[PDB]
């Protein structure tokens, strides 16, 4: 399955590096996010984001 | 045919392996 | 026996492609590795 | 000169050269070292040295020639060189000798000589012989659990067990009329195209060779010879290469070529070459090299070969190269292709232009056994014309870069790193 057009993908090496090194920092990015969202709604009610609602009239 | 002394080769090579060898001595061996 | 009978390794040996299928896996994965590792260096 | 083609049962072929007058006439077979299961080893050897071995006084007593014979992968061939004016005696003694009748030839007291002759000479190749020593381990451990790894003379323990039934029966199942040939090379024009083909002046036994269930592998396997007691070190490396017949074998021969041979102790090599040559100099690394581009029917083996009085520069002289061989995927200059070209322009004309007949006769029957007909000497140079940097970097990026090596070793090999360092070394730089 693996054709040519991933075959050519594993033979540059001088450029690699900063594109590696960005998928690196986007893929850091969307798991603090999806880590952030988890740990918000695991727990409703204790956090301080509906407080401010619960004490609204 | 009449053999004598038939104790080459194959003898010892036959315990091994069987479906390796390539199937068509093994009609030559059995007979 | 000789040097020449080599010894069977049957019992690790895979199935009989040794293509890129391996080294495309081991590169992928190292790749990811590096990932990591770099994302926590930073 | 010209090749001539005709087939009835058999294939019959002649490459006249009138210049030359030494008449070689002689059959060649199909099935040689390849066409064996490892019980069974040396008995194309023991059939080489028992053609060799007695009739070699009827032949020169009755008549006048000298016979020869080789076996390399799968060509067990058995020349018959003689006089101009002489070829119609020596096909009758090749008649004789092999269709009717083997028994005489077959005798116990005969064959007990051969085998101790054999023996003897095994013994004295696996002592003294190191470079070959480790081109056949090389070949034993790139091809494992393969019809084409074992050796080419057979392994000390495989040949006091088999004595005259296994003989006969590799007579019977490998010497046939589908993979055999009557070369013609020397200065005879007609009579060999004409008496070859004969109501039954033809090998009996009309039947197929047996076919193999394992075509070929290759798998990087390393095997090590270490032994102190030796003063050299003589190590060999390889990947895959192509097998005859494929639109590679030429650019791999050009490959092989580039780099070149090498030799230390000659004031005519140490000025010469390319870059690896002046990184070497300058400390006395290497004494020999051998760019070898290997080539059967059914895989390849382009590879490397040294041996060096130093034992601690071993891994230096195997960094540098790995590193030109890097090299040679990316960037290589047109005057290097231009040069290559040239040597091995010059390389293959005197490959096929030795005066020999058994050499030519042997080169024919290699090249006529897979293809049909001889690939000529122009035709070759003008495909050899037609490579270009193009075509040489493409190769190289197939084959070379990142794939799997054997490497082979005996003498001092203390100092040499296992595989994953040399391996490493051919994608870990930058690119
Ligand atoms: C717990 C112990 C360690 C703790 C941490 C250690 C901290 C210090 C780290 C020191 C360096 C180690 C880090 C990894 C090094 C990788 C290996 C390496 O660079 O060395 C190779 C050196 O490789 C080379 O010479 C070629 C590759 C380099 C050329 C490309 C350079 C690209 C840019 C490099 C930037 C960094 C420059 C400084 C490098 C030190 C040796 O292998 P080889 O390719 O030579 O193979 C062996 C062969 O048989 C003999 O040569
Ligand atoms: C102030 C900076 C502090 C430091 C800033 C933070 C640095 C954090 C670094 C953490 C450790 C990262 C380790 C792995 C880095 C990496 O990508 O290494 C891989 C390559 C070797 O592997 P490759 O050759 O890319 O593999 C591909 C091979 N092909 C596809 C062609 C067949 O390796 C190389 O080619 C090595 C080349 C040299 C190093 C390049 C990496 C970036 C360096 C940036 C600065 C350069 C100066
Ligand atoms: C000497 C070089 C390292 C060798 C290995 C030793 C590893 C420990 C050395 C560092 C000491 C502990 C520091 C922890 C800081 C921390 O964990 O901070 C939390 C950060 C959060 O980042 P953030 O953006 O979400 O929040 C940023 C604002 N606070 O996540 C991480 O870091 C993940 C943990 C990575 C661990 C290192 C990765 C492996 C080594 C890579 C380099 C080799
Ligand atoms: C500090 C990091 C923590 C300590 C070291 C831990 C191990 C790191 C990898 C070591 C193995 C190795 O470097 O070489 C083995 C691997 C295997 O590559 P390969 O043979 O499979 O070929 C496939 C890839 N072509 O090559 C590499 O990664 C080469 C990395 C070279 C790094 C040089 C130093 C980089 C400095 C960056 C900052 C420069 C300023």
């Keep these: 399955?693996?054709?040519?057009?991933?075959?050519?993908?594993?033979?540059?090496?001088?450029?690699?590096?900063?594109?590696?090194?960005?998928?690196?920092?986007?893929?850091?990015?969307?798991?603090?996010?999806?880590?952030?969202?988890?740990?918000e709604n695991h727990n409703k009610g204790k956090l301080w984001k509906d407080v401010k609602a619960r004490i609204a009239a | 045919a009449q053999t004598h002394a038939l104790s080459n080769a194959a003898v010892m090579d036959l315990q091994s392996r069987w479906e390796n060898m390539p199937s068509t001595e093994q009609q030559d061996i059995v007979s | 026996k000789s040097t020449y009978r080599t010894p069977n390794f049957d019992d690790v040996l895979k199935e009989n492609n040794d293509a890129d299928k391996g080294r495309s896996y081991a590169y992928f994965m190292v790749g990811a590795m590096g990932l990591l590792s770099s994302a926590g260096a930073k | 000169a010209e090749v001539t083609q005709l087939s009835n049962g058999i294939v019959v072929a002649t490459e006249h050269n009138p210049s030359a007058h030494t008449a070689s006439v002689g059959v060649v077979f199909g099935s040689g070292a390849a066409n064996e299961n490892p019980y069974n080893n040396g008995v194309s050897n023991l059939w080489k040295n028992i053609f060799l071995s007695k009739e070699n006084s009827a032949v020169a007593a009755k008549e006048g020639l000298?016979?020869?014979?080789?076996?390399?992968?799968?060509?067990?061939?058995?020349?018959?060189?003689?006089?101009?004016?002489?070829?119609?005696?020596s096909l009758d003694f090749l008649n004789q000798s092999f269709i009717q009748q083997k028994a005489n030839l077959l005798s116990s007291s005969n064959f007990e000589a051969t085998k101790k002759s054999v023996l003897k000479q095994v013994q004295d190749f696996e002592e003294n012989d190191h470079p070959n020593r480790v081109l056949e381990?090389?070949?034993?451990?790139?091809?494992?659990?393969?019809?084409?790894s074992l050796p080419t003379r057979g392994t000390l323990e495989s040949l006091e067990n088999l004595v005259v039934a296994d003989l006969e029966s590799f007579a019977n199942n490998h010497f046939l009329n589908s993979n055999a040939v009557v070369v013609g090379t020397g200065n005879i024009k007609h009579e060999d195209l004409v008496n070859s083909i004969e109501s039954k002046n033809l090998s009996l036994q009309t039947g197929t060779k047996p076919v193999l269930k394992k075509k070929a592998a290759?798998?990087?396997?390393?095997?090590?010879?270490?032994?102190?007691?030796?003063?050299?070190?003589?190590?060999?490396?390889?990947?895959?290469?192509?097998?005859?017949?494929?639109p590679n074998y030429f650019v791999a021969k050009l490959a092989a070529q580039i780099f070149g041979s090498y030799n230390a102790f000659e004031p005519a090599s140490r000025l010469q070459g390319i870059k690896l040559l002046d990184n070497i100099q300058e400390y006395q690394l290497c004494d020999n090299f051998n760019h070898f581009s290997?080539?059967?029917?059914?895989?390849?083996?382009?590879?490397?070969?040294?041996?060096?009085?130093?034992?601690?520069?071993?891994?230096?002289?195997?960094?540098?190269?790995?590193?030109?061989?890097?090299?040679?995927?990316?960037?290589?200059?047109?005057?290097?292709?231009?040069?290559?070209?040239?040597?091995?322009?010059?390389?293959?004309?005197?490959?096929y232009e030795s005066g020999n007949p058994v050499n030519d006769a042997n080169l024919l029957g290699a090249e006529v056994l897979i293809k049909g007909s001889k690939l000529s000497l122009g035709e070759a140079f003008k495909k050899i014309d037609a490579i270009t940097v193009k075509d040489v970097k493409a190769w190289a990026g197939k084959r070379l870069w990142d794939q799997d090596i054997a490497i082979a070793g005996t003498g001092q090999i203390e100092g040499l790193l296992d595989y994953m360092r040399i391996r490493s070394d051919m994608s870990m730089m930058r690119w």
Excluded: C
């Design chain 4, 66 to 89: 000298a016979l020869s014979s080789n076996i390399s992968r799968d060509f067990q061939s058995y020349i018959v060189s003689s006089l101009p004016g002489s070829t119609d005696k």
């Design chain 1, 1 to 39: 399955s693996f054709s040519s057009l991933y075959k050519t993908f594993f033979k540059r090496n001088a450029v690699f590096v900063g594109t590696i090194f960005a998928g690196a920092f986007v893929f850091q990015t969307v798991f603090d996010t999806a880590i952030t969202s988890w740990y």
């Design chain 4, 137 to 148: 381990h090389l070949h034993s451990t790139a091809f494992q659990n393969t019809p084409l």
């Design chain 4, 294 to 351: 290997l080539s059967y029917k059914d895989s390849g083996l382009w590879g490397f070969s040294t041996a060096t009085r130093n034992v601690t520069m071993i891994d230096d002289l195997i960094h540098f190269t790995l590193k030109q061989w890097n090299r040679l995927t990316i960037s290589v200059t047109d005057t290097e292709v231009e040069r290559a070209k040239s040597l091995l322009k010059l390389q293959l004309g005197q490959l």
């Design chain 4, 218 to 246: 290759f798998l990087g396997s390393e095997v090590r010879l270490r032994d102190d007691t030796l003063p050299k070190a003589w190590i060999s490396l390889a990947v895959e290469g192509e097998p005859v017949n494929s």
